[PDB]
């Protein structure tokens, strides 16, 4: 048991399905835009599992703690580009761009 | 077109060297397959012929 402190790996599993949420390594919309799908994992292992929380406001500061509701960017350990909500031509995807 | 081309050279000069780092450490192919979905082989053969 203990707190969080900003800029740091994350572990998220999805509680229903006892899997570990994390990235693919497909695209899809036939376009290059390369943005692995973001989808549950297996296993934990894999290192494409984790994501960080890093600076997204200049409320908070790298470094500091993380409150209720507090808005947050967060990026893949592996994939370099950041977990968004891909608002393409489908109904508002969330892809890893 | 010379814009694209230094792009190109810009991209292969910081591309990792070789296995060195490549066969051991992951962060090298990392890299090299994120600048590889950049540029796939098919049009870098219609480039050059």
Known sequence: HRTLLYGHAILLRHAHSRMYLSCLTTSRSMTDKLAFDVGLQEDATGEACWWTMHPASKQRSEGEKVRVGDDLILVSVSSERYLHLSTASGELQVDAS | ?49
């Open chain 2, 1 to 49: 077109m010379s814009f694209y081309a230094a792009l190109i050279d810009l991209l292969g000069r910081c591309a990792p060297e070789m296995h060195l780092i490549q066969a051991g450490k992951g962060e090298a192919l990392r890299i090299r397959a994120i600048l590889r979905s950049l540029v796939p082989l098919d049009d870098l053969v219609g480039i050059i012929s």
